[PDB]
């Protein structure tokens, strides 16, 4: 820290303006662990600089003064310590309120102006900090959908700065206009597409649901889905279908003799058996190593792993499951049939992943797996100790009898929540009274007011997720296409669409520019 | 979704079982549904090995079926 | 009166220690009702491990809402 | 639950706090490390020439509201 | 359980001479919206009767704010 840095914050515009005229150094970085991020502890990280300090400040004089001042200019393009120039800090202040927002974005575009005035060659936005961010990706992956709606749909009116918008509107009718999107970093780039950023977000992300429904995203991903994507989808579905059907006829005709491998005999039915058993086996092969491919190339955190990636996961065990029961197969031990049902019951559910990606039935998907991750496991806690508590009670009063034992009477006790109860299963007791007031007691506070309790607290919490799994809808679906792409077996270009267009031509100097804009025609039926 | 749960636990339940009276996809699927009328035997056959299989296929059916999704559903309706 | 709508889990803890009490009393006072003391201590000894979930934002609003819906509702209910 | 899912947010905090008010009581080994937050001379100037000490606690708090 | 009362009485600054010594907040250093106070935590954390985490933790239920009481920036620190 120096005087420079409390002139700024202090907002002493005459005090800079003497210690820039004494020769301070506008470069000087404040860079103790107070003006880190460091989340541990308490701090104010603002890019380490003056000129990050006095942007971050909403000082637009300052800003001003810095740049274009004749004893000391202040290099626009300057990097703090984690790589962060002022557009980096600017987007890092942000916390999507509406002032905020509002003058946030109103200090970028100056910044932009500025830059373009004083260093026409030089493109700001494309400067990347220490992680690979632009403030753009930054702005993506950190939820900051103020400044990334301004970013995304920025259209500046005036000579010498056109060059810097990202909309351009062609032609306007009354309600209806149409506008044409840059698509630079959105679409495809070296490293950090908003799209591959927002959908491999982890999850902490504030409006990772909300972000795709910035007009440009939202055009560009319904326009992928129709164009490429919606017939591969369901082309997987169908192909899973299929290996299910397989997996489960396979399966259900298995040989009932002892002690695996079992001979092929030579006639037709145990030849399409053998062929399923191949094909499921081929398929779980495949789904192990996509698993391993994803977990490689996420690398999740051990606790996004499960509120996050949930179905990678499900896909990833059954996978597991699979290869055990190869594994047993030919170590000659029946227990792979203990293996292989579970896959099967899981490839079954795992069905429920296609249907996400249908607004309707893919809420229902969702919900599941809300539910079984938090309140599912928070119910069932509850409710063991219970179970647990009042078993243990009722086999010690219990003596020498059939049920006599924690798996028998636990088991009986549990019967109690699906109605079926016997409420006498057995006689072999002393004190009748203390084994009745007890069973009463279990059934009343687990199966009328713990499961109706239960009730209501899903009810609560379906209420309050119906709005958040209205967007993960779409979230899903952009993460469909994003790996679609990704994968396209192919070699096919036709997936980056949108055009090659000139935009204006007359760049600062005498280039012209292509950016492969993408063309949006909207209607607007309101702000006559 | 009650029907993929269903059909999915029925064919992991009757690969399980070998050589008994249910041993069908008829049967078991009968039988795993009347978990969802509260009438559901949750012994009903002994015919297979590994008992600690088959319990923990029918505990987690009715976990997922019973507990979790009807209560869904009462919830759902209940918003619409 | 506060002592059922506050100092729940106390009431709660005594109850489970005096059942143990007066297991041990007839245990040798050569009663085998002991063993219906026993249990009912055995029983509570379980569900009063809920006391621990309290004091987590999460798990805590779970036996919270127990408490609470047994003292009011369930008895208006059961009545 | 509708009406009671507010009051038991905080209920979390209050009994956290009982916890940790028995914990202390009972302590179970003369243990004084429980006191924290220091000794310090807050202003020096009493009304009289004596100085204070009044075992402030530091708290740093981030608000970006009110500017 | 007058938490208006308590919230006033725990974060008092007062700034003028001679009445200094009365505030029970003080601020060291503030910079951005990051700044440091020193709370004086006196018949807080402990005292001869009646501290105020002792007060408010044996209150009888009755007591209005008596959740929300221990929000107040001082006790809410202090406790975590
Ligand atoms: C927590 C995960 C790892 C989980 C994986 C397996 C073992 C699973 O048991 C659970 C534990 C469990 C068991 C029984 C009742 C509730 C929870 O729940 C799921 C998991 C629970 C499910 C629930 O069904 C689903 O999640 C379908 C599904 C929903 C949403 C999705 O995005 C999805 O993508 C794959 C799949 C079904 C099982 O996989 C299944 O079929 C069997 C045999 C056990 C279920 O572990
Ligand atoms: C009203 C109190 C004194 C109470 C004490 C005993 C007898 C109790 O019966 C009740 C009466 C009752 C019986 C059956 C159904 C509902 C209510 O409910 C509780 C009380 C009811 C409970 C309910 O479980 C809990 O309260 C666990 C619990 C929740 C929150 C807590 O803060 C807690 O701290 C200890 C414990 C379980 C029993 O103690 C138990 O395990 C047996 C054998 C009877 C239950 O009396």
Redesign the pocket.
């Known amino acids: 820290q120096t005087a420079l840095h409390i002139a700024i914050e202090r907002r002493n515009m005459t005090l800079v303006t003497l210690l820039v005229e004494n020769g301070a150094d506008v470069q000087a970085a404040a860079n103790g662990d107070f003006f880190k991020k460091t989340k541990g502890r308490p701090g104010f990280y603002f890019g380490e600089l003056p000129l990050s300090l006095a942007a971050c400040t909403n000082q637009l004089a300052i800003v001003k003064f810095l740049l274009q001042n004749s004893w000391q200019p202040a290099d626009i393009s300057a990097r703090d310590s984690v790589g962060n120039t002022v557009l980096h800090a600017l987007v890092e202040v942000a916390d999507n309120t509406v002032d905020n927002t509002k003058f946030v974005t109103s200090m970028y575009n100056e910044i932009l102006i500025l830059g373009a005035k004083l260093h026409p060659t030089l493109k700001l936005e494309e400067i990347t900090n220490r992680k690979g961010l632009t403030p753009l990706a930054l702005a993506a992956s950190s939820g900051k959908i103020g400044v990334l709606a301004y970013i995304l749909q920025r259209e500046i009116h005036e000579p010498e700065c056109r060059h810097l918008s990202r909309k351009f509107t062609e032609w306007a009718y009354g309600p209806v206009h149409s506008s044409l999107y840059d698509l630079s970093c959105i679409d495809t780039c070296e490293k950090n597409s908003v799209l591959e950023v927002i959908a491999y977000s982890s999850s902490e992300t504030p409006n990772r649901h909300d972000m795709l429904l910035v007009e440009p995203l939202n055009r560009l991903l319904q326009d992928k889905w129709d164009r490429f994507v919606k017939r591969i989808f369901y082309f997987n579905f169908f192909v899973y279908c299929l290996y299910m059907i397989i997996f489960t006829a396979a399966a259900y005709y298995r040989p009932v003799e002892g002690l695996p491998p079992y001979k092929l005999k030579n006639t037709v039915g145990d030849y399409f058996r053998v062929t399923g058993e191949i094909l499921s086996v081929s398929g779980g092969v495949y789904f192990f190593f996509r698993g391993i491919q994803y977990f490689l190339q996420r690398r999740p955190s051990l606790k996004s792993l499960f509120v996050d990636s949930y179905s990678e996961i499900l896909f990833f065990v059954q996978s597991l499951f699979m290869l055990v029961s190869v594994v047993l197969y030919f170590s000659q031990r029946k227990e792979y049939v203990a293996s292989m049902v579970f896959s099967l019951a899981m490839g079954w559910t795992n069905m429920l992943y296609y249907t996400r990606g249908f607004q309707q039935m893919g809420i229902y998907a969702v919900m599941i797996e809300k539910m079984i991750l938090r309140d599912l496991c928070r119910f069932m806690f509850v409710y063991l100790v219970?179970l647990f508590?009042?078993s243990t009670?009722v086999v010690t009063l219990i003596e020498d009898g059939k049920y006599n034992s924690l798996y028998s009477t636990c088991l009986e006790l549990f019967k109690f929540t699906i109605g079926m109860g016997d409420l006498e299963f057995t006689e072999n007791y002393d004190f009748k009274a203390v084994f009745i007031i007890?069973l009463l007691?279990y059934v009343?506070?687990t199966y009328i007011?713990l499961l109706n309790m239960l009730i209501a607290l899903m009810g609560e919490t379906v209420n309050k997720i119906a709005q958040e799994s209205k967007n993960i809808w779409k979230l899903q679906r952009a993460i469909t296409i994003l790996d679609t792409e990704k994968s396209f077996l192919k070699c096919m270009r036709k997936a980056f669409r949108s055009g090659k267009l000139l935009q204006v031509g007359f760049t600062p100097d005498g280039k012209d520019d292509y950016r492969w804009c993408f063309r949006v025609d909207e209607v607007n039926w309101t702000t006559w």
């Open positions: 219970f508590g009042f009670a007890l007691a009343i506070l007011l």
